[PDB]
Design a protein around this nucleic acid. Structure first.
Lengths: 97, 101, 101, 97
DNA sequence: TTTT
DNA sequence: TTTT
DNA sequence: TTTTTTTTTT
DNA sequence: TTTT
DNA sequence: TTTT
DNA sequence: TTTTTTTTTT
């Protein structure tokens, strides 16, 4: 029984690097992933996936990616009145030339 | 330039919700409890609850064959939506589902 | 009781091999170079070379649109075969492919 | 650019636990995964996937699973005249009641 | 060389 | 506000 | 630039 | 609150 | 015996 | 027990 996600998209904003009171880096990025087909009106829409990164992954994503950066992410769908649902990234690939 | 896929194995929290669009298309809403590998501070196994939408025959078949409790394997893509008091939803749109009971 | 899925993003090592069964079905053979995340003892990036089989329109389309070098995203399942001097093959049978160029 | 595999099948043999000359446990299991449809003759065939496990994963798989055990595995397709291609498992789940 |  |  | 479909409510 |  |  | 198809050579 597992939970696995592969996304490659583009960051909609500079990554949001914060630190927990314990000292752990944690970042929130949102990935625009265009679809592969057009809708009735002939347009390509994107899905906007919120991913949360931790520690070194978070710091490095922040260092090396801005708004617009092409990024690969794998991880799991996590879920946390407040009904939130994100991808918890364990590895990030930087794909900017 | 872009890619979006997901694979999941989990149990249905409730019987599937089988509806038809006024066009005539079957669509189903299902929520999967996916138990984590690790444990918490109390030594318990928490699950993540992922909402999946199914379409056409997949919707009907999972309706017909699975119910609350059914172990199900799903592959598809994450999709995001807003509706209206404006809400943000992220689901998995299932392409296939495997009945694992 | 069972489940088998794979997702892959890699580059084609050669133009796709488009054939037709004597039934009339398009089928394509493609090998994907999937570069690893880590590095070796020399600090180089090695790739894994995964053979994928495509069918019907997917075979034709990937034939028509991709060539040696094309970045491609694939999802499907692992399948195993023996033929005849008897050989053991494991491939990925692609359900979908995304053209990522 | 990634490589991810989810299998849940049944071991065809007791796991093959060996140790490298350095001391690392390494195991080779083969997973029977039945398909979901019948072939022309009305039969369900299986795919037999060779997976290689390392270290603690290898030792634990050996300890707790025999021929017949239901097992979940995620990992990547690895490839190594000798033309071999397996799944390199990073996590194994034991699903035997 | 293939499992319930 | 959820499954075994 | 394409797959089977790319389509509803919550 | 959405990217090339 | 392979891709960027 | 079902999805679109469950079908070839290497």
């Amino acid at each position: 029984m597992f939970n696995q996600v592969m996304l490659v998209g583009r960051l909609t904003k500079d990554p949001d690097l914060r630190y927990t009171s314990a000292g752990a880096a944690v970042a929130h990025v949102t990935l625009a992933v265009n679809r592969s087909f057009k809708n009735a009106s002939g347009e390509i829409e994107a899905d906007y996936v919120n991913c949360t990164l931790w520690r070194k992954t978070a710091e490095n994503t922040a260092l090396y990616c801005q708004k617009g950066s092409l990024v690969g992410v794998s991880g799991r769908i996590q879920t946390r009145n407040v009904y939130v649902t994100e991808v918890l990234a364990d590895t990030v690939r930087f794909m900017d030339p």
